[PDB]
Symmetry: C3
Subunit: 131 residues, 3 copies
């Protein structure tokens, strides 16, 4: 039983996790929410747990990506964010706060989105002449 | 009449908009240009209007992505940038300026690119055992 | 002889280059390593050469993307990073260091990853009514 492009398997690692949910039929990403309380310090960073484990389908990876509103209004950006299809740890959201005020996060706050990006997985061939 | 992977529909919201254009046959992104005058403050941010509305084809999303030259030389990065295929508002470019000098933008300046990224849109199934 | 989704052609531009390598079967990205010595200044940026030229397959682009560990622990992020499938120059990694200590890089250090993202390449049709 593996994840497919139509069906992605997810496990809650605690009672505090909130399942990913897509805000509309063609929204690029699932909403991700914080499982705990955090602060993203001004000019600083914070790794936020979702307490989810996800199985992104093979042929894809999961990109943790920014919510537009928090970026435009609160100077929040997403670092790291490449979730491999065999990654089975706690799905974390690395937030950068480029503003001059701390950004407060309570459990349940939506703080990123999660896009299932289609990729190739080529092998490498070293050549002496590219073209 | 919907957008397809071969044909993306775009509407100018004012006389000041410039249509997206691909710099070469296999360039990843369309050039996006500012419709107005702006400054990206040093260590700061600015949302730049293109005055375009776009209909990204279903099965994809539009990623506003950085121009390499402005990033390497002028410390410009792109925040936010996940454009859903049902988004019909003004296509904005959120710029972060991590440098110590302001970054000036005049109408017509190319300030981002726009990549049509292929994605899956899976549903979620919560399980007790991922693998 | 062109690159395909199964086989990506790469050329070493010097003896100091290290070939991209995928850490596991389904890892999203190839590891990229520095060919020279660098420092990413605190609150600053640095363009790092790999001394590789790559031929990303048509229908895709290469995204230089962050390594999770350096982002979470050392506040390192990747700027620029859209490698077009016809780009034949030295594959550079633009690093931003948002921390307050310099980030030292020696030849051979792994400092980014390289994801082959699948894209559409639509033409533009300007319309008066999107939907």
């Amino acid at each position: 039983h593996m994840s497919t492009p139509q069906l992605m398997r997810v496990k809650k690692l605690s009672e505090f996790a909130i399942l990913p949910v897509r805000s509309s039929q063609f929204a690029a990403g699932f909403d991700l929410a914080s499982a705990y309380d955090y602060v993203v310090p001004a000019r600083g960073k914070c790794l936020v747990k979702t307490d989810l484990a996800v199985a992104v389908p093979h042929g894809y990876y999961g990109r943790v990506a920014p919510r537009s509103g928090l970026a435009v209004k609160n100077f929040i950006d997403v670092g790291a964010g490449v979730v491999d299809s065999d990654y089975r740890g706690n799905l974390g959201v690395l937030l950068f706060n480029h503003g001059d005020e701390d950004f407060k996060i309570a459990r349940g706050d939506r703080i990123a989105q999660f896009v299932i990006e289609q990729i190739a997985l080529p092998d490498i061939v070293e050549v002496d002449d590219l073209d």
